[PDB]
Ligand binder design. Sequence first.
Ligand code: HEC
Ligand code: HEC
Ligand SMILES: [S]
Length: 230
Amino acid sequence: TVALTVPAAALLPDGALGESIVRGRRYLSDTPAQLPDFVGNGLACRHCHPGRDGEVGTEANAAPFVGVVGRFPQYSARHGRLITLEQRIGDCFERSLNGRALALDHPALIDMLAYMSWLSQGVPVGAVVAGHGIPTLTLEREPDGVHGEALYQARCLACHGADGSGTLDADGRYLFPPLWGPRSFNTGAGMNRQATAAGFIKHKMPLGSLSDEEAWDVAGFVLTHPRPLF
Ligand code: HEC
Ligand code: HEC
Ligand SMILES: [S]
């Protein structure tokens, strides 16, 4: 692997590319408001691909976009063939955002690509960045949703809600996003898989330490709930 670094915003180039990168960041951080025709729920890309300092997709083990562009095209078992990054983005509009894929030459899509390419600056094509993806956590027993419910009430509810519906900010964006129900990710999302949810939770939640057993069980509880069908 090569190490994960984030380029400096102050070194963004003047011109069409620089303007595209800035728009891309906003599409990824504020997706439902910026692309209403394509987003079917309350999630922005940043809700599973967080970043520091206003950026999106810069955190190890939370599927960073740093270095993503050099890994496509690649085989997708979902598709049964090689796909491009444009297509991959569409898949998460359809699944995690319960919406519709953008046309493959849509200017918003190209702006998102430009932002991902900027984050990937300096990464050798083909190289794998340390911390890419969301490493799974898998335990050798069933997730205990009773334990999970108790953990949820004690460790998660204050942000994500008794009903899993999250907490809105003053501008109508989710400060703390919905974990289940009609505004959350659909059943086609990667986050709907036990080992992926458990892995994400293990490394990233509660925001700002859970044991493996705790992450596994609370992921189990979260995933017992209804969400939109894909
Ligand atoms: C208690 C252990 C939990 C569990 C099971 C989850 N969270 Fe959170 N969460 C918070 C914020 C701001 C985000 C967005 C991403 C970020 O900026 O880091 C998240 C994201 C999640 C997700 C993915 C998104 C989704 O809607 O599904 C999941 C699965 C998730 N969380 C589970 C904020 C908070 C908190 C506020 C301080 C606390 C506490 C938690 N989360 C705790 C948990
Ligand atoms: C949680 C509900 C998610 C939301 C909202 C979005 N994405 Fe996502 N994404 C998610 C997971 C669990 C994964 C798998 C990580 C792994 O281990 O590979 C992904 C993956 C991607 C990828 C591929 C990354 C790679 O390294 O190959 C891309 C390009 C991607 N996601 C883009 C993306 C965009 C543009 C989103 C807003 C439309 C978005 N995702 C939302 C979980 C979630
Ligand atoms: S995604």
